User: What shape does this take?
Amino acid sequence: PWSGYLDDVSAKFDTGVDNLQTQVTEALDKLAAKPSDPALLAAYQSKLSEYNLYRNAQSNTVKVFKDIDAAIIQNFR
Amino acid sequence: PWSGYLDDVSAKFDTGVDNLQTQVTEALDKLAAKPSDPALLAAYQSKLSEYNLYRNAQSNTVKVFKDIDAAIIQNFR
Amino acid sequence: ISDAEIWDMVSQNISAIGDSYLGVYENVVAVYTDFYQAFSDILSKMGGWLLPGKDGNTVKLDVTSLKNDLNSLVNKYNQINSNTVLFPAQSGSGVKVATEAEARQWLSELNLPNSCLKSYGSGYVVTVDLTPLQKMVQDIDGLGAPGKDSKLEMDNAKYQAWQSGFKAQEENMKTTLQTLTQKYSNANSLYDNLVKVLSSTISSSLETAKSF
Amino acid sequence: ISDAEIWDMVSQNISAIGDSYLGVYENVVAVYTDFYQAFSDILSKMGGWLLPGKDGNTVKLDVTSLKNDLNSLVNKYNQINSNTVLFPAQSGSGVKVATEAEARQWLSELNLPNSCLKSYGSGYVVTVDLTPLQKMVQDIDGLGAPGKDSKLEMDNAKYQAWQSGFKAQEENMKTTLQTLTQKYSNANSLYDNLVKVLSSTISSSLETAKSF
Amino acid sequence: ISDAEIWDMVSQNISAIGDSYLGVYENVVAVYTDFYQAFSDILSKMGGWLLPGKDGNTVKLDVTSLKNDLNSLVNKYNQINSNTVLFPAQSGSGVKVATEAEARQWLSELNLPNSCLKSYGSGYVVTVDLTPLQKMVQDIDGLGAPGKDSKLEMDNAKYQAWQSGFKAQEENMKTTLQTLTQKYSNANSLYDNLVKVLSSTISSSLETAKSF
Amino acid sequence: ISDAEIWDMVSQNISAIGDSYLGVYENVVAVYTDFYQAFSDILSKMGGWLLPGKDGNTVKLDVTSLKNDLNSLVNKYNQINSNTVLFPAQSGSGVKVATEAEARQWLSELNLPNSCLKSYGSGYVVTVDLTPLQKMVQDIDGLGAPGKDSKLEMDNAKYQAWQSGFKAQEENMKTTLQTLTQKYSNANSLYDNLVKVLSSTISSSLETAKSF
Amino acid sequence: ISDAEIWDMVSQNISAIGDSYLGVYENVVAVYTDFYQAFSDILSKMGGWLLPGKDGNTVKLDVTSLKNDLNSLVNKYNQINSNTVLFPAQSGSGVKVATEAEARQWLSELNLPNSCLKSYGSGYVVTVDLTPLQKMVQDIDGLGAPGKDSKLEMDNAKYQAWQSGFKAQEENMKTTLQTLTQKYSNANSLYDNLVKVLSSTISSSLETAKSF
Assistant: This one.
């Protein structure tokens, strides 16, 4: 329904978060299928890192676009 | 062709980061070629620490101008 | 120029050496253990080939049977197949070629004689060192000839020395097996130490300070 | 698409791997050590099975007792119970079956002869490699025939050769056990940083910045 | 519903398993090292009961002395005190008892034979397995009876088999001790991994955001 | 009442355990390594006392030289000085005594026999366990007598038995020293966890909300 | 009285330990690993200097060649250069000298014998522990005199005694190397903790509250 200038910014990263959930779930499943390799452990760290990076980047975006105009509305007078 | 002061500071770091990123791969593939020695592992470790510490220096040298200019804006009245 | 691809190359090269560095050691150990099992089978079969002669110190030695069996072993392990290959870790089907540079850089560390590198039409392969086995099977012919219909007649004075030398050959081959097995402790521990390249992701993910 | 249950699925994945990957290997080493202990009992019983003869090089060697004992050990180790199976690591009660693909994937890393796969009626199981014991029990029959009422008559040289073959077979069994035990460094060493999947809990708990 | 007592619960649980899991392993390793100390002493003593016989291949071996020594060792280890109990890790004075379920679980995880559980009237205790040593004592009786007033006569051919059996038993005990000690790599490491319950205080104390 | 002196006692008790808990460990492992360095010097130096006996099965063994060397080692290591004491880890000059309570506490967790406490007049000290070595030099006497002017006449079977006993003692001392070194994994780890009392100064400074 | 001088002090101090405490350990590890590589080369060369003698239990061993090679190695590491010094981690040009105080104070924890301090006329340097290696060089002539123009003959019992002594010496040196490398747990991690001196630039620079 309604969406401001922050909701769309948040949803901009939502196209990759779902993809990365699917990919990391497959990573866990294929690790369960066979764990006798460090390649999957390395891919696991490569993918969980990208997950944390997406989440932290989205949090930073919403925080900075909060503070971009919190100060402007503070001196809105 | 815009590049502000923050972009100016980042310009002095991007050219350094690119060289480290190009040489860390040349360390990694060499290590994968002949991993039987520990000296090449130490060289790769040193190059990786080089890359990451320079990247962290870039990361911190920008948030330290952020608060300087923000404090200027606070007293800008 | 980005970092997702360098993470990908780390996750790829951590496995590129699994089947190229540790897997080679794995098949080396497996094939050499199978070699030693076959040699032990030949030794066990050799036991029941002795008879007392003249009811004294003389004991017949079955030269022809040992010569035939060791010649057959040499012939069947002189080939290049999944059970007679050391390098480049052949598995599944066919025989994989290799160039001489990596063959030399491997044999330098394996501490093996030069006469182990052969050419399989196109590339180069490494087989088990038959030099101790071949020298001993040549020496066994240098202590007599099969003039008798069945086996040599010979006193135990030289027989005991010959058996001591044969057990010494077994001891040398077993020490080679022990060295190749301890190569794991020189490599498997090295591999589990080298798998700590994962700092390249651990530290490069906690630099998120780029975006808080 | 959930993160609350991803930690639970991580925990259950770690739990399933422990009893499907580590517990299986523990049961393998346990049953194989029991096998080695039983064989050590058999070898210890060998001492009271020799008799000096002719006041010379001849020693009567008991073969009927050894044949019966080894045949009995094979019979008790050829069936399927909690003390004979190594995969799929039976425990508690009953016998669990396994598929062909997983049996092959286990035999590929266990380095065992293919003559070990048998069917428990419904499915398939993996058993201890009995080939060395078989080869030894038909080879001991190669020392002659039990014409005497008690035991074989045989001079010292053939006894020495047979004992050398016997000890070679036993060092092969011992090095098999050493490989299985050393697979600690192949299983627990990588499980120690495979348990680091808990980063999916800790590193996904620093995301509180999403809720400030 | 309280979060101040949860930290006390954590503190008391961490020390409640120190003497329940790692302390038990500590006392088990200590008592097994004492057992191996006794066995190594009795083995080093054993070098002093051999003589040549008839100046030939025959060498006497003292059986009554070895039988007496081993039986005395068993009898001293067959009681229940702080020097011959595995669980529940008695210390200081008296004998602490244990219930059937946890003793059975510890026995199953330690992989020891059934003849290791004794009932100390009230509860149950776990003792060292005496099966290998009793087996050796029974087999050394398979070499005959102490017909001579001092010791038995027996040739080198039988001596090699007897020494092989003794070495097999000794290496079985060595492997049991090695397994017990290597249980530390899988016990202390996860104890240090479980000390990370301190996160329960770390993260819950950083919750001062509840009060700004 | 104040909480600035808590910061100073945090420093002073880390000082009071840096050289009283980890310091005693490093001193014990150092002196024990020096002990085994001297003992291995003796053992390697033992090798040059073998001669063939009558060019046959006999091989002369030196007992008097080993007796004198081992007795000298005991005498030099039975005293109390800088290189013969474990606790209280005396260093620099003089001899530092310790009280009985802490001596017993350290004996229990160092896993040493009760026959190790020596009193240096005032208090108590804990030294290396010399019981295996002294019992070894005692039992080497029971190997025979040095009636000959130089060395004892020693046959191969008894020599092999004595060497088996010697190697058993050697691997026992290996196990002891390995446990002592592995006690780093138990002590240095907890010390590096306990140096995190630095949080008690970091966190008690982030309380600056009292003064904004 | 200033804070910028505090920051300059921190900047110069964090460098006054990076190359004067951690750098010392790094260079010590590097040179000691070079020494160990030389030892491994010597071992590999020696591994092919064996032969049977009299076609029996006697073994030929090359004593003069090993003596000459090891004396050359010792007297080449008995000098002072960039590859034979531990402290003060000489590099670049010339040879860096040192006085008694810090040299003694840090060889105290480097745990080296007294016969390891060398004098370069003006100052003092720390060199590797040649004492075990000189001891092996000395006792390799404890086997007797080289009667043969080529190499010594000795019965196999003495051969395994000598090889066991040599293995004990090399494993003692390996334990020394392991301890010296594990000293990184006390040097590198401790320097990683000590670099937190920058909290003066972190926390004391937050005192801009003095300037609003």
Notes: The beta strands of chain D are 50-53, 58-61, 85-87, 117-119, 124-127. Chain D has one domain: 1-212. The longest strand of chain D covers residues 50-53.
